Design a protein around this nucleic acid. Sequence first.
RNA 1: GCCUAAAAGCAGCCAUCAAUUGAGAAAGCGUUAAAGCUCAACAAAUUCACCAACAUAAUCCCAAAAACUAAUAACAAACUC
Lengths: 162, 174, 222, 97, 45, 176
Amino acid sequence: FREVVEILDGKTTIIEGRITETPQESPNPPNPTGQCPICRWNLKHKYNYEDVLLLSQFIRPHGGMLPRRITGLCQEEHLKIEECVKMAHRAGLLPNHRPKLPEGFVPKSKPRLNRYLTRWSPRSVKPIYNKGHRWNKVRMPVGSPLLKDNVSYSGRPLLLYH
Amino acid sequence: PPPTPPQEETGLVRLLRREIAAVFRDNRMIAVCQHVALSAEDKLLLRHQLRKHKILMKIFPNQVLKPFLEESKYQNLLPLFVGHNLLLVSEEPKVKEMVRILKGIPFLPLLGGCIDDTILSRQGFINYSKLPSLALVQGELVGGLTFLTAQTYSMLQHQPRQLTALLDQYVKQQ
Amino acid sequence: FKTLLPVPTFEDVAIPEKPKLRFVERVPLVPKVRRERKNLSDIRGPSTEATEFTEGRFAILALGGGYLHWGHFEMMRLTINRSMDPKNMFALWRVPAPFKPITRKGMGQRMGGGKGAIDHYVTPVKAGRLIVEMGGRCEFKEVQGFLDLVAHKLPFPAKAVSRETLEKMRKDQEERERNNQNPWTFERIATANMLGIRKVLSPYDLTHKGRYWGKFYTPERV
Amino acid sequence: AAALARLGLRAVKQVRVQFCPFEKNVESTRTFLQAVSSEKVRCTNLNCSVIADVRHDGSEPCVDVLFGDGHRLIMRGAHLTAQEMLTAFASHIQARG
Amino acid sequence: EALAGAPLDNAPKEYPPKIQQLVQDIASLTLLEISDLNELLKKTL
Amino acid sequence: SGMIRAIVRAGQARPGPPLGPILGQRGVSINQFCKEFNEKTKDIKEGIPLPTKIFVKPDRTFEIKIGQPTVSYFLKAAAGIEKGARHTGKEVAGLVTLKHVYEIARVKAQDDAFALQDVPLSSVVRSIIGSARSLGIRVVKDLSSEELAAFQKERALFLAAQREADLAAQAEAAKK
RNA sequence: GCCUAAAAGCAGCCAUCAAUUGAGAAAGCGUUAAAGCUCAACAAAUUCACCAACAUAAUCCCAAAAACUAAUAACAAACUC
Ligand SMILES: [Mg+2]
Ligand SMILES: [Mg+2]
Ligand SMILES: [Mg+2]
Ligand SMILES: [Mg+2]
Ligand SMILES: [Zn+2]
């Protein structure tokens, strides 16, 4: 991994780039002939928002996603993993993947409400005051429709709107 | 993925390959310079100054120049042909006036090139420009070869010249 | 660096005289004096006429059924004439002039008393029929761009198709209807009268195969 | 080049890019030179001196900017991206000057 | 076959062996051969 | 400030638009520019137009660079017509010989464009031929003894009929 | 090139040629007219990139809730044993 460092010594600015050692892929994948990382490690339709050990492999230390041209995922798996990382960040997993603000960490605010499988952003959804009748019911979306192809061991489909 | 669908060569890339081959085969001085983004009026001015000394500039796509270069005997020019490129092509390599006219523009750096199958850097080009003419050096090689016999004759004739100079200084003393 | 591809050249196409769309009359030269019933079968079902290209290369395809009257005709004519190039493009109709009389009654009239009075004329259009057909030495991108407006302003759903796009969509429909996975199809069940479904179905459903419902047409319904 | 032209480079005296074109890590520095020596960057200020030092055995490509605030920005670019160097140089120029 | 390495003047210490081998072919011959060499070189060049 | 292109007459440099407001907004005065232009082109036949480039500097100073006259003017003069043809390709305006084209190319080669471009006279002759094709002037190989006048008579009759037809169309549009 | 007060790629009509490795008498903004900002062409790279999203009524919203422990389950009639 490359790091950009700045040195200030008497109105002289030195910008330097330092390369450190990075971990590599595990030596024995279960499906070596697969072109995609997930689809060759056999994690397709297997991960979720809880699998932080997989979602944290390719994200920036400030919680941002990594480009597909650099990672190598197929487009659908990239979108799925992006939505899963969003849902994990909203649910509260990956707490060390946030920027450190020493000036903003002191003014504590209202306690964080616990949530999970959050599809939209908490600051953009409006409360459903009408809620509809039985025939026209305003259903509340839960989870993402991109994870509708995951393996269902119980056989029942996932209720994406409830 | 399925096997490779081999892409077929077209007339444009054939023309480009043939032109690059003709350039690398016919002329002698092949200088590589960085294609700097200047005003087209200044580009035309440099083109005029180049055609004054009968040297031309060419621009070829990397996609057709890199494979030809790594297939030919010019594989040592690969670190030069990555970014923007300018091929200074000329018969009768005369680097003196070339470096003279390139010195006027400060931020147009000479990358390198080849002088008669001799790959040189900027310092090599400067040294070749400062080097005398081929006629001068081939006339001076004969002198440097016969210099041994010349100094032998001078040192065998210096013995009477020593006494001669002794007599001259003794005369000049008074 | 990108390769230089050749451009399509049109020399065999001939632009005929009067390439613009001709004016259509609101009422035919001989008005129908006898009032006719509103047969909705001229809207129901698939189109049998004007389903293929005659001389042009692009057209406006109707994915549903409806009525075209003088307002629609004038809209299409004006838009196409003002957005076309008469030196390189020509257009022609594929639907006749409004001929079917539509009767109306005054406001405040009670039910009964007889038939109303002929208000205006319409042109019945079924699903899958071409409305305007264009050709010339032009490409499809510009024609599609300026024909999507007319296709949207038409009553029924419509698309700006060409020969290639029409054949592509028909072959795609064939591929879907041939590689469908579930063994139960509307055509099979209706033809075999499985579960006694003919009691709720219609005698025209045996030919519509569940793709046409009234005046609407669902092209993704096999 | 456009981001530099829209910055008002009038407050810079000398910019020298010293590199060796026969290396494997001079791509970013060469593009930095071509971006800082564009026509728009030339015409936005004519008092600036842009030098391109070409060596063969230096093996350490770097850039040096001395601008009239008495300020010296020195960046030894061996692994930095051209975009990162451009943004750093632009932010520093707009911060001091 | 390939091209040269194109060295610079920073650490220039290796000369091509041809200019040394010509010096050895020069220094391995006699004075009559030196006379023939410079007479031939003076007539041709 | 920047460069300004302007096709100005030889000695007819008026201090009004379409050159007054531009130089005034740039900051340079107009009377000084007109004086300089007239003293620089006093040796030129007053009336013929030529392109020039005015480089206005940030200190409200200006320099002038005058080039060769317009190719359209050269062709109109060599053909003997005052105004070009309206419908190029369908009608013929004048008749110019390749000799006249070569002379025009030789006189025009000493300009900014063909000076910055080291190019033989062949491409300049090609440019003159293209400009003549745009103007509507035909270029015959070797045909000028009296058929030039024979075509000039027909051209004058055509221009007279065209003027009468234009007046008739104007009157029709007026009474309609 | 004509028209026009001005018509400079761009109210309009006609041609649509010409050098450069490479740039349309110009496909969009802009000026009274220029200027100026883009698009396409070379040189620099090359993740994917065609259409698809659309407010509302009056007494008070309207079961509560729930995305994974195995389901051609189970519970369910005046039907049938
Ligand atoms: Mg509609
Ligand atoms: Mg472009
Ligand atoms: Mg509202
Ligand atoms: Mg029971
Ligand atoms: Zn994949």
